[PDB]
Amino acid sequence: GQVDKQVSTAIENIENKLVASGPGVTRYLTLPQTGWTPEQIRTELDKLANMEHTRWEDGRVSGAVYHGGQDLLKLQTEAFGQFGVANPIHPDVFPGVRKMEAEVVAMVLALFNAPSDGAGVTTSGGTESILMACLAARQKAFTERGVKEPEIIIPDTAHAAFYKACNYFGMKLHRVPCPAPEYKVDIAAVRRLINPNTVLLVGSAPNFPHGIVDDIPALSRLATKYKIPLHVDCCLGSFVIAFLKKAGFPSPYEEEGGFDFRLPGVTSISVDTHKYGFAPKGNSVLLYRNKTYRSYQYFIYPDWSGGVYASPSVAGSRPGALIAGCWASLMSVGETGYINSCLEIIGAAKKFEASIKEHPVLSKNLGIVGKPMVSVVAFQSQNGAVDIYDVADGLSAKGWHLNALQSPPAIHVAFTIPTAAAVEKLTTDLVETVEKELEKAEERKRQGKGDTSALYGVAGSLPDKSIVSRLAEGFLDTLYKAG
Amino acid sequence: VDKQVSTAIENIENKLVASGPGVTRYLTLPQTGWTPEQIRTELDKLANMEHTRWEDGRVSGAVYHGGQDLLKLQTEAFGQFGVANPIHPDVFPGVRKMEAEVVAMVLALFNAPSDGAGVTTSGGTESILMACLAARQKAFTERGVKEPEIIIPDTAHAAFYKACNYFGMKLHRVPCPAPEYKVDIAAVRRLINPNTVLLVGSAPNFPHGIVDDIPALSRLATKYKIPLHVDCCLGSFVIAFLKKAGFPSPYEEEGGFDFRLPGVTSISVDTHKYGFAPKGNSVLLYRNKTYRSYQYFIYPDWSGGVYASPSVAGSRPGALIAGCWASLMSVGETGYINSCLEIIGAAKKFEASIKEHPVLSKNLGIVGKPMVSVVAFQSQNGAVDIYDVADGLSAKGWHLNALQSPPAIHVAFTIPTAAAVEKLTTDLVETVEKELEKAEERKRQGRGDTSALYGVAGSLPDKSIVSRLAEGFLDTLYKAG
């Protein structure tokens, strides 16, 4: 009962927090009987656009909007306008799109020093990329090594999409710890888990939670040695991780052959053109060391009454409009653009990182998680008087949308062109937030002795996960609740 | 074999990859960003590359509306919601709303129950995948099934195979025999076993545009307590508005083909076909939230925080969502009824033409009894090879769909193609006539046409051949240099 009531309450709170109601909220739950007018639609749409929301425009949201620049957005919009009806599955009908796509891939292959037989596909997103990589490896190991009970070895810090992959394609997952202070995968632990049913090694460049780049060289050595495909999740490093050297920022493992196709064990890399490529959402690229590989992810069904069906990825039908958007984005930004943006973003990251380490308050109370090199800075509490989640809620109350982590308890900022412009303000607000909690503790001690974010703390520590499970289930339901 | 293959592939590449003077191939990022005007210029160039003229209504079921007014609106929506990502509802509430509303509107269209739930997917493929996954997870959680099986009609969409391949399920193909080209209910029944986790039905099916016996499937589904999924991807809005338009509604008098039938647990609908939403916009419908839930992915233990996603994709395009939404609102019931009237009208007209026109009626035959937007016809004359007809129309600039079982061609009518039905009829007549003449000279004395090679390869003992051929195609799709 009680658990139930608590849950229901929590859900109700979520719904009350996400579902926007109140006078003015017209809920359109059935098709209009007569078509609205263009102006009508435009009006309503503006109305929607101006709903109250975390002001990403004010650079207060972590890694949600990477560029946001009107000029670019317009361009993307025009591209969309020109290729609105384009569907690449019909290259003979939409050749332009087909070209643009190919080119996008090419351009990315180059960024990561791909071999000449390098091949790649566009995917809707990093999730899809990862899925397809996994599938690829599975099919590979099946066709070649006749493997039937597939296994993949991932770091704990690895992106959940991998678990999704294993869940979907029926693979056994192995999570290796990334212990402090390095917060990098345990190579020995990886080695130990390698067995004949291992079909994929995974590495992160960097990883979502902490923004740490795993020991891709070491993983490559293992991969080469045991003849197992290495996949690099670079979704989040995107362009930024690549332009690091050009920007002058140290490139992860430069002196050990980098983190990309330069390393012979690296067989597949996933890159999100929509994160730091600044492409429209719905634009990622998966790279394979050779066509031979890529092929495993293809779906061909020749016996179909409707004709031979062939699809390179998950989707049959896709949006040429978005493809074109991605393309132009790349062309409009260009090497210079990316170097510049890199400079800014990484600069901001480094500045923040310094702030935490140096600022008299922060340096005493907080600590950086590992040694982040890219665009993601994760920090945790080094003072038992300051609960990190409390800090999170404190910043949230100040209008910040940062990312709360679990293992360990921490917060991360994924810096984007917007957030980079707000770094100082972030620093300020963080200082103030921290101070406040210190006073609270002081007041607690004075008194002798309400914690929010407990969902990630108390609930994070809760014995069963069923609780958080139901909580999320609600969230998701809410996402589609209109009535 | 190898040489033949390689040649074929080379022909494909030489037929899809535009080369030749002026074809600038950008294989690396420009060193300095291009200017807006430069980009616009290039983009126009790309847009005006030579291609099958869908604008002239010569492409089957690729562009459903294509109307400038709508496109502009969609474009504006995209412009306003370019950066929107629904996974952040607190950041992009509008999108979150619009989505929910879309789902609702569709749920209504198919007479969903009050506890009816639904998600948006990128497309019908994804819808189908998610339905299959849902069923699987259901049967696992509830009936502890470990070796899942699904029963589908032969005419069912390949995405089902993809689903089974992906999620490791056993697939059962049931025949759809002439003249009905509907699934064999008896054969379905016989295959039902404790490991059966999903029954499938088509409304209509892609190849022949036939609606399966959804009532019967519903009965079986209720009886054996197995989920029924209706693939409605291709019936989309048009099948929903058929009766309103005045055209007969499949199985009206037996409770229709949608949630009115108690056995119908899930329906997949493509807002991007006849909803006229931008590409990347489909909806999956479930009789109850409880059901829908099975397709959700929740990973709570993740160091980055509790991950939860409703479908395949984590990140998604709010721009597209908003576009789809507006499309609906801008078109409205009236609009859809009108478009239905036109499209179905055209289909029927074509169907009649084939049955009545002195030439065609003698040489061709409709496949089954189509009622929707897909009209499929085959050769009734051994002198006329359907694929040859296909190639003939192809030479006339038509992009129609060539089928295998049986050998046939289909037209999926869209606002464009509907406007060209007459011209299509004319060109078809002329095409047929030609092949008849050819056969005359043939018989008077005693080669290989492309489509024929497609048929020959499909008639070959092993599919490995065609497989490779397809692979090549796909590779081509990503060849830039």
Numbering used by the authors:
A (entry chain A): 85 to 533, 540 to 573
B (entry chain B): 87 to 532, 539 to 573
Which sentences from the paper describe this structure?
Deacylation of Cer to sphingosine and subsequent phosphorylation by sphingosine kinase lead to the formation of sphingosine-1-phosphate (S1P), whose irreversible degradation by S1P lyase (SPL) terminates sphingolipid metabolism. SPL (EC 4.1.2.27) is a pyridoxal 5′-phosphate (PLP)-dependent enzyme bound to the endoplasmic reticulum membrane through an N-terminal sequence, with the catalytic domain facing the cytosol. The protein is a tight dimer and belongs to the Fold Type I family. The active site is formed by residues from both subunits and comprises an Y-shaped channel whose distal part is largely hydrophobic.
To confirm the soundness of our virtual screening campaign, we solved the crystal structures of unbound hSPL and AfuSPL at 1.8 Å and 3.5 Å resolution, respectively. The structure of AfuSPL was solved at low resolution. Structural superposition with the human protein results in a RMSD of 0.82 Å (between 412 Cα pairs). Notably, the AfuSPL structure displays a structured N-terminal region, consisting of a long helix that is not observed in hSPL, although its presence in hSPL is predicted by AlfaFold50. This helix is positioned near the active site access cleft and, at least in the soluble construct, is much more flexible for the human protein compared to the fungal enzyme. Moreover, AfuSPL has an insertion of six residues in the C-terminal region that may also alter the dynamics of the substrate binding cleft. On the other hand, no significant differences are observed at the active site level, where all the residues likely involved in substrate binding are conserved. Finally, it must be noted that the position of the additional N-terminal helix that is observed in the AfuSPL structure suggests that the protein binds to the membrane with an orientation that places the active site entrance on the opposite side with respect to the membrane surface. In particular, the N-terminus helix, that is structured in AfuSPL and disordered in hSPL, partially covers the access to the binding poket and provides additional hydrophobic residues to stabilise the binding of lipophilic compounds, and this may account for the higher interaction of AfuSPL with ANS. A clear explanation to these data is not currently available, but we could speculate that this is due to either the structured N-terminal helix in AfuSPL, which could increase binding affinity by partly closing the cleft and preventing ligand dissociation, or to the increased flexibility of the regions allowing the access to the active site in AfuSPL, which could favour the adaptation of the ligands to the active site cleft.
